[PDB]
Short mmCIF file of C-alpha atoms in Angstrom, two decimals:
data_model
loop_
_atom_site.label_atom_id
_atom_site.label_comp_id
_atom_site.label_asym_id
_atom_site.label_seq_id
_atom_site.Cartn_x
_atom_site.Cartn_y
_atom_site.Cartn_z
CA UNK L 1 21.24 20.96 165.64
CA UNK L 2 18.06 19.39 167.18
CA UNK L 3 15.29 17.89 164.75
CA UNK L 4 12.26 20.73 165.41
CA UNK L 5 8.66 19.24 165.34
CA UNK L 6 5.90 21.82 164.78
CA UNK L 7 2.83 21.89 166.17
CA UNK L 8 -0.35 23.85 164.97
CA UNK L 9 -2.73 24.69 166.87
CA UNK L 10 -5.77 27.04 165.95
CA UNK L 11 -9.32 27.39 165.96
CA UNK L 12 -11.63 24.67 164.31
CA UNK L 13 -10.13 23.43 160.75
CA UNK L 14 -7.57 25.86 160.25
CA UNK L 15 -4.66 24.70 160.96
CA UNK L 16 -5.35 21.31 159.46
CA UNK L 17 -6.32 23.20 155.87
CA UNK L 18 -2.84 25.46 156.38
CA UNK L 19 -0.99 22.44 156.34
CA UNK L 20 -2.83 20.56 153.55
CA UNK L 21 -2.22 24.04 151.69
CA UNK L 22 1.26 23.80 152.25
CA UNK L 23 1.72 20.17 151.54
CA UNK L 24 0.33 20.84 147.85
CA UNK L 25 3.09 23.36 147.64
CA UNK L 26 5.59 21.32 149.26
CA UNK L 27 4.60 17.57 149.65
CA UNK L 28 3.81 15.63 152.38
CA UNK L 29 5.31 16.39 155.95
CA UNK L 30 6.41 14.70 159.03
CA UNK L 31 7.23 16.00 162.14
CA UNK L 32 4.27 18.49 161.66
CA UNK L 33 1.17 18.00 163.74
CA UNK L 34 -2.36 19.90 164.14
CA UNK L 35 -4.91 20.66 166.44
CA UNK L 36 -7.81 22.46 166.30
CA UNK L 37 -10.13 23.93 168.95
CA UNK L 38 -13.71 23.60 167.85
CA UNK L 39 -17.01 24.46 169.73
CA UNK L 40 -17.90 22.24 172.41
CA UNK L 41 -14.08 20.94 172.82
CA UNK L 42 -13.54 21.32 176.64
CA UNK L 43 -10.41 23.60 176.80
CA UNK L 44 -8.68 21.43 179.57
CA UNK L 45 -9.04 18.53 177.76
CA UNK L 46 -7.43 19.73 174.37
CA UNK L 47 -4.95 21.21 176.84
CA UNK L 48 -4.03 17.96 178.09
CA UNK L 49 -4.04 16.37 174.61
CA UNK L 50 -1.45 18.99 174.00
CA UNK L 51 0.55 18.34 176.25
CA UNK L 52 0.45 14.80 175.56
CA UNK L 53 2.22 14.97 172.35
CA UNK L 54 4.90 17.73 173.47
CA UNK L 55 5.70 14.93 176.29
CA UNK L 56 6.33 12.64 174.39
CA UNK L 57 8.74 14.58 171.51
CA UNK L 58 10.59 15.80 174.09
CA UNK L 59 11.05 12.53 175.17
CA UNK L 60 12.16 11.66 171.29
CA UNK L 61 15.01 14.55 172.02
CA UNK L 62 12.96 17.05 169.50
CA UNK L 63 12.91 21.03 169.37
CA UNK L 64 9.00 22.06 169.52
CA UNK L 65 8.09 24.92 168.07
CA UNK L 66 4.17 25.52 168.35
CA UNK L 67 2.31 27.91 165.67
CA UNK L 68 -0.55 29.72 166.34
CA UNK L 69 -3.33 31.31 164.55
CA UNK L 70 -4.34 34.62 166.93
CA UNK L 71 -2.88 36.16 169.41
CA UNK L 72 -5.26 35.83 171.66
CA UNK L 73 -8.01 32.87 172.00
CA UNK L 74 -8.02 29.38 173.67
CA UNK L 75 -5.52 28.05 171.49
CA UNK L 76 -3.18 30.41 171.88
CA UNK L 77 -3.80 30.37 175.70
CA UNK L 78 -2.74 26.70 175.49
CA UNK L 79 0.62 27.59 173.36
CA UNK L 80 1.13 29.94 176.61
CA UNK L 81 0.46 27.12 179.21
CA UNK L 82 3.05 24.91 177.07
CA UNK L 83 6.11 27.71 176.91
CA UNK L 84 4.99 28.04 180.82
CA UNK L 85 5.98 24.74 181.44
CA UNK L 86 7.94 23.35 179.03
CA UNK L 87 10.05 25.87 177.50
CA UNK L 88 8.54 25.63 173.67
CA UNK L 89 8.86 28.62 171.30
CA UNK L 90 5.50 30.58 170.12
CA UNK L 91 4.20 32.32 167.17
CA UNK L 92 1.22 33.73 166.13
CA UNK L 93 -0.69 34.99 163.12
CA UNK L 94 0.41 32.03 160.96
CA UNK L 95 -0.23 32.40 157.46
CA UNK L 96 1.23 30.16 153.78
CA UNK L 97 4.27 32.64 153.05
CA UNK L 98 5.63 31.55 157.19
CA UNK L 99 4.33 28.05 157.05
CA UNK L 100 6.32 26.84 153.94
CA UNK L 101 9.29 28.83 154.48
CA UNK L 102 9.80 27.17 157.91
CA UNK L 103 8.84 23.74 156.75
CA UNK L 104 11.68 24.21 154.24
CA UNK L 105 14.30 26.04 156.29
CA UNK L 106 13.58 23.68 159.69
CA UNK L 107 17.18 22.05 159.36
CA UNK L 108 18.75 25.26 158.32
CA UNK L 109 18.51 28.04 161.28
CA UNK L 110 18.14 27.70 165.20
CA UNK L 111 14.69 27.90 166.15
CA UNK L 112 14.95 31.76 167.37
CA UNK L 113 16.76 32.58 164.01
CA UNK L 114 14.01 30.63 162.27
CA UNK L 115 11.30 32.77 163.93
CA UNK L 116 12.70 35.97 163.35
CA UNK L 117 13.03 34.76 159.30
CA UNK L 118 9.14 33.50 159.24
CA UNK L 119 7.82 36.57 161.47
CA UNK L 120 9.36 39.47 158.85
CA UNK L 121 8.21 36.80 155.54
CA UNK L 122 4.76 36.29 156.78
CA UNK L 123 4.44 40.30 157.60
CA UNK L 124 5.88 40.78 153.55
CA UNK L 125 3.45 38.65 152.27
CA UNK L 126 0.14 40.78 153.54
CA UNK L 127 0.17 43.17 150.72
CA UNK L 128 -3.06 45.11 148.87
CA UNK L 129 -2.94 44.71 145.34
CA UNK M 1 -22.77 50.49 151.09
CA UNK M 2 -22.95 47.59 148.84
CA UNK M 3 -23.19 44.23 150.41
CA UNK M 4 -19.51 42.66 149.85
CA UNK M 5 -18.73 39.21 148.74
CA UNK M 6 -15.52 37.33 150.08
CA UNK M 7 -14.03 34.71 147.71
CA UNK M 8 -11.17 33.24 149.35
CA UNK M 9 -8.31 31.28 146.95
CA UNK M 10 -5.85 29.05 148.17
CA UNK M 11 -3.89 26.21 147.56
CA UNK M 12 -5.78 23.24 149.19
CA UNK M 13 -8.18 23.42 151.78
CA UNK M 14 -6.62 26.01 153.15
CA UNK M 15 -9.59 29.22 152.82
CA UNK M 16 -12.04 26.15 153.49
CA UNK M 17 -10.29 25.43 156.97
CA UNK M 18 -9.63 29.37 157.59
CA UNK M 19 -13.19 30.09 157.10
CA UNK M 20 -14.91 27.22 159.34
CA UNK M 21 -12.18 28.25 162.11
CA UNK M 22 -12.93 32.11 161.91
CA UNK M 23 -16.57 30.84 162.38
CA UNK M 24 -15.59 28.92 165.69
CA UNK M 25 -14.36 32.27 166.83
CA UNK M 26 -17.81 34.66 165.27
CA UNK M 27 -20.05 32.23 163.93
CA UNK M 28 -21.50 31.12 160.49
CA UNK M 29 -20.96 33.96 157.95
CA UNK M 30 -22.67 34.69 154.97
CA UNK M 31 -21.13 36.11 151.56
CA UNK M 32 -18.12 34.02 151.98
CA UNK M 33 -17.07 31.44 149.27
CA UNK M 34 -13.63 29.70 149.20
CA UNK M 35 -11.75 28.43 145.90
CA UNK M 36 -9.06 25.69 146.89
CA UNK M 37 -6.30 24.32 144.43
CA UNK M 38 -4.98 21.10 144.18
CA UNK M 39 -2.09 18.98 142.94
CA UNK M 40 -3.35 18.37 139.30
CA UNK M 41 -6.03 20.71 139.04
CA UNK M 42 -6.43 21.88 135.46
CA UNK M 43 -5.87 26.02 136.49
CA UNK M 44 -7.79 27.46 133.26
CA UNK M 45 -10.94 25.42 134.22
CA UNK M 46 -10.38 26.84 137.81
CA UNK M 47 -10.49 30.44 136.19
CA UNK M 48 -13.37 29.82 134.62
CA UNK M 49 -14.95 29.14 138.00
CA UNK M 50 -13.90 31.69 138.84
CA UNK M 51 -14.64 34.33 136.65
CA UNK M 52 -18.02 32.59 136.83
CA UNK M 53 -18.68 32.95 140.80
CA UNK M 54 -17.78 36.53 139.78
CA UNK M 55 -19.47 37.53 136.93
CA UNK M 56 -23.01 36.01 138.91
CA UNK M 57 -22.10 38.33 142.55
CA UNK M 58 -21.44 41.03 140.23
CA UNK M 59 -25.30 41.05 138.89
CA UNK M 60 -26.33 40.69 142.90
CA UNK M 61 -24.58 43.83 142.62
CA UNK M 62 -21.89 43.10 145.31
CA UNK M 63 -18.72 44.37 145.68
CA UNK M 64 -15.78 41.93 145.41
CA UNK M 65 -12.82 41.63 147.82
CA UNK M 66 -10.37 38.44 146.90
CA UNK M 67 -8.59 36.77 149.29
CA UNK M 68 -5.06 34.68 148.34
CA UNK M 69 -3.07 32.61 150.54
CA UNK M 70 0.69 33.48 148.74
CA UNK M 71 1.71 36.53 146.75
CA UNK M 72 2.55 33.73 143.83
CA UNK M 73 1.40 30.49 142.31
CA UNK M 74 -2.15 29.79 140.74
CA UNK M 75 -4.44 31.28 143.61
CA UNK M 76 -2.97 34.60 142.85
CA UNK M 77 -2.08 34.23 139.54
CA UNK M 78 -6.27 33.70 138.91
CA UNK M 79 -6.94 36.36 141.29
CA UNK M 80 -4.72 39.36 138.62
CA UNK M 81 -6.67 38.12 136.37
CA UNK M 82 -9.53 39.10 137.63
CA UNK M 83 -8.46 42.55 137.87
CA UNK M 84 -7.41 43.25 134.60
CA UNK M 85 -11.18 42.77 133.58
CA UNK M 86 -13.40 43.59 136.47
CA UNK M 87 -13.74 45.87 139.65
CA UNK M 88 -12.21 43.85 142.33
CA UNK M 89 -10.16 44.34 145.25
CA UNK M 90 -7.15 41.56 146.05
CA UNK M 91 -5.08 41.08 148.73
CA UNK M 92 -2.37 38.30 149.61
CA UNK M 93 -1.18 37.05 152.94
CA UNK M 94 -4.69 35.82 154.32
CA UNK M 95 -4.11 34.68 158.37
CA UNK M 96 -7.16 34.85 161.05
CA UNK M 97 -6.88 38.47 162.70
CA UNK M 98 -7.15 39.47 158.91
CA UNK M 99 -10.38 37.06 158.33
CA UNK M 100 -11.59 37.79 161.91
CA UNK M 101 -11.39 41.62 161.58
CA UNK M 102 -11.82 41.79 157.39
CA UNK M 103 -15.87 39.31 158.51
CA UNK M 104 -16.60 41.49 161.88
CA UNK M 105 -16.13 44.72 159.95
CA UNK M 106 -17.37 44.09 156.63
CA UNK M 107 -19.98 46.27 156.79
CA UNK M 108 -18.41 49.15 159.08
CA UNK M 109 -16.00 50.65 156.25
CA UNK M 110 -15.71 51.16 152.57
CA UNK M 111 -13.39 48.19 150.90
CA UNK M 112 -9.95 50.70 150.47
CA UNK M 113 -10.27 51.14 154.04
CA UNK M 114 -11.35 47.82 155.31
CA UNK M 115 -8.09 46.30 153.63
CA UNK M 116 -6.00 48.85 154.48
CA UNK M 117 -7.43 48.03 158.22
CA UNK M 118 -6.88 44.02 157.54
CA UNK M 119 -3.27 44.23 156.39
CA UNK M 120 -2.25 46.27 159.20
CA UNK M 121 -4.12 43.95 161.46
CA UNK M 122 -3.00 40.89 160.04
CA UNK M 123 0.64 42.09 160.03
CA UNK M 124 0.17 43.02 163.53
CA UNK M 125 -0.64 39.88 164.44
CA UNK M 126 2.33 37.76 163.90
CA UNK M 127 4.07 37.96 166.35
CA UNK M 128 6.85 35.93 168.38
CA UNK M 129 6.37 35.44 171.89
CA UNK M 130 9.43 35.50 173.97
CA UNK M 131 9.50 33.72 177.26
CA UNK M 132 10.21 36.74 179.40
CA UNK M 133 7.42 38.11 178.05
CA UNK M 134 4.49 35.58 179.38
CA UNK M 135 4.22 37.37 183.22
CA UNK M 136 3.94 40.38 181.32
CA UNK M 137 1.14 38.66 179.60
CA UNK M 138 -0.67 37.09 182.53
CA UNK M 139 -0.83 40.97 184.25
CA UNK M 140 -3.08 41.82 181.34
CA UNK M 141 -6.47 39.14 183.05
CA UNK M 142 -6.36 41.52 186.01
CA UNK M 143 -6.11 44.76 184.78
CA UNK M 144 -7.47 46.81 181.49
#
């Protein structure tokens, strides 16, 4: 199995903070990068930066998973454009249980099963007490 | 309706960044506070701080919703302990679609319906995107 690389693309500091939070739980990550879309960012500039990252990682023979905050919106639109061009895989609605499970099982499952796993865990992790 | 106050408790800077992120989308919000738990944090101290915030907001006649990152660990432990003593509601597994819906509709629904609403929106907002679905998503940009 190819080594995986996780790109987190979200609004503002969400991805940065989500990774920070996960790292409190499971320690400092390699092979995870965050890109945040802030008010005042040009989406085409951000798109080109994301593409830069993907090419670089593909050239390192890595398999790429893009995790997005929200279905719809500029981060999602960027992720979709990368799937159109580079055949990376994409999942939306990322939360903490998903990211922790993803990063601790990244070597265990193939990308398709990995994403199905965390989709299920993410939904199950949302509970009104 | 009483005004609502949302307290987000998570590991590290997750809650802080989640709120930052949501405000890019829906603009600056009021009545939302974040508490992050880091390694080596004295958690009984954090619990005490949270209780103080809750007491204060209750004195301001606010209805309190606590949102946590994870069903597990210290943030949920703290949230549970508040629920045992105070009239607060708790929801776990917070994500962007949930928080955006929560804050945008905070004065439209009572807490019970509100948490039910955002639970469904949060789960529905978690989607694996199939490559084969790309073209169909693109069509939606040209019709309603």
